[PDB]
Write a protein that binds this ligand. Structure first.
Ligand SMILES: NC[C@H]1CN(c2ncnc3[nH]cc(-c4cccc(CO)c4)c23)CCO1
Length: 248
């Protein structure tokens, strides 16, 4: 038996009447079948845990993350301490490597979908837009536009089909930019976007790039690459100098 204590954002905080264990419950009014199936596949310390579901309407039982969303740890126009950003980025990569390893792409990575537990461990949240991109070791290209414009990779806007993995890598790059600068670089990654044009012309003397140290900036130079085929992959991110730099 669970008491619904408060609304978290609909999602409510449920507390067990006997054990007082707290979980989050997602309530949807009547595709949900897919989200549940994907959630049932998921088991990793940087992915929100799925506990089960009950039907009537539909209820999803999810790991409660008391630290809230990463979004709220980001100070507008400033960001956060670089060591905090690195630690969160490490954990983000951990989660994303896990997902890609089981053939799942999140497709909407952004700070609103990155939660923190009581120890400030990052948890990737919400698989409502996620999909399978590898099955029986065979990759399938994506073609549906999904995600959130400031975070989407340029190939989603220009190409009919594209690989799932570089898209998630890109959005993680924008998250990192936000964590380090406290702002998003562009409304969308298109040529009609002056700030995107400037980035492509390497005007890093402009904001948000001017606020970012050269070492993390060098990593961003390899992530925010327009050609998804030339974009740095995760295995190579893990070899990056800043990624491996000891920090406070
Ligand atoms: N805007 C606040 C946000 C909070 N979010 C959660 N907060 C605390 N623990 C949680 N566990 C699971 C969720 C959650 C469930 C479904 C979607 C999302 C959004 O990324 C989070 C959660 C609940 C939603 O609102």
């Amino acid at each position: 038996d669970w008491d619904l204590v408060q609304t978290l954002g609909e999602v409510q905080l449920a507390v067990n009447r006997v054990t007082e264990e707290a979980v989050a419950v997602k309530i949807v009014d009547m595709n949900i079948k897919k989200e549940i199936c994907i959630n049932k596949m998921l088991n990793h310390e940087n992915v929100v845990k799925f506990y089960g579901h009950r039907r009537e309407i539909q209820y999803l039982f999810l790991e409660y993350c008391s630290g809230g969303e990463l979004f709220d740890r980001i100070e507008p126009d400033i960001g956060m301490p670089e060591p905090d950003a690195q630690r969160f980025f490490h954990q983000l990569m951990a989660g994303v490597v896990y997902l890609h390893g089981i053939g799942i792409t999140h497709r909407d990575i952004k700070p609103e979908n990155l939660l923190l537990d009581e120890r400030d461990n990052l948890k990737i949240s919400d698989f409502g837009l996620a999909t399978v991109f590898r099955y029986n070791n065979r990759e399938r290209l994506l073609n549906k536009m999904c995600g959130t414009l400031p975070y989407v990779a340029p190939e989603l806007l220009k190409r009919r089909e594209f690989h799932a993995e570089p898209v998630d890598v890109w959005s993680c790059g924008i998250v990192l930019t936000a964590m380090l600068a406290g702002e998003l670089p562009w409304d969308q990654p298109s040529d009609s976007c002056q700030e995107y044009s400037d980035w492509k012309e390497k005007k890093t003397y402009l904001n948000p790039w001017k606020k970012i140290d050269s070492a993390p900036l060098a990593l961003l130079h390899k992530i925010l690459v327009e050609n998804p085929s030339a974009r740095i992959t995760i295995p190579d991110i893990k070899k990056d100098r800043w990624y491996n730099k000891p920090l406070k």
